[PDB]
User: What shape does this take?
Amino acid sequence: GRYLTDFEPIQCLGRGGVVFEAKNKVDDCNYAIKRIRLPNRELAREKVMREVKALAKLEHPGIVRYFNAWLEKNKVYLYIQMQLCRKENLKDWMNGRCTIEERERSVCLHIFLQIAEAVEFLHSKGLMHRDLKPSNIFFTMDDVVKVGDFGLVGTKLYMSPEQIHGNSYSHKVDIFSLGLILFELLYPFSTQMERVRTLTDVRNLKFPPLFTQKYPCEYVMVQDMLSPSPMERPEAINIIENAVFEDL
Ligand SMILES: Cn1cc(-c2ccc3c(c2)CCN3C(=O)Cc2cccc(C(F)(F)F)c2)c2c(N)ncnc21
Assistant: This one.
C-alpha cells in the first residue's frame, strides 16, 4: 500500500521492528521509516496507538523530527516516518576518535549536554526514554545531536540494574544511562575489549585512576548518576545545571 506506492526503498538501517531509509517520490527527500508489527490483541494495540498520539505532539531540538504515522493491513503494520539522521551515530563517532586529543573536553560536554537536555524535556512531560546508548544516539545532517528511537514498546551495558532485573522503575533509569555515556564520551578506548572491560567496571563504580584525576568534577557526577539505588540519582535538571557545563 502507501509505503510501496509513495516511497522508494534505499536501504535497511536497523532491525530489532525494522527501520528503512526511503525516498518519498513526491517530495524527493530521504526519510528513516520504522515498520512495527501491531499486536493482535485489541488492548495491547490500543496501548501502542495511545503512545503514537502522545509522541507525535513532541517538538524539541534533541528529539528526531516527526513527519507521519499510518497503518497498513499485511496482522497489521504501523509505519512511522522520521527525519533521516546521519549514518555515523554516537557509537561510530567515538570509535573513530580513540585518543584523548580526538576527544576535546568542550566538544564532548556539548554533545552530552544536548542529550541530557532532550532527556530533561521528556521527563518534564512525564515520559522516559528507556533506550539511551551510543548506537541509538544520532546526529542530523546539520550536526544537531538527537536521542534515538524510543516508545511504542541489544546490549544491556547502559541499562540500569532495576531495568535489567525487571523491577519497578522510574525516569531515574535514564539517569543511569546518562552517567555511563558521559564517562564514555570523556574516556577513549584503544580496543573493543578494553571498552567492555572498563565500562563494566564503571557500572560497579570502579574508575580508571587517570579519569578521576583528569576529570574530578565529572567523576563525582558520574558516580552519583550510577547509584545502584535510583532515588539517589540526580534529576536531569540538576545535571544540566551542574557547574561542569558553565563554560559555554
Ligand atoms: C536507525 N535509525 C533509527 C532512527 C529512528 C530515530 C527516532 C525514531 C525512530 C527511528 C522511530 C520513532 N522515533 C522516535 O524518536 C520516537 C517518536 C518521536 C516523535 C513522534 C513519534 C510518533 F508519533 F510516535 F511517530 C515517535 C533513525 C533515524 N531517524 N535516522 C537515521 N537512522 C535511524
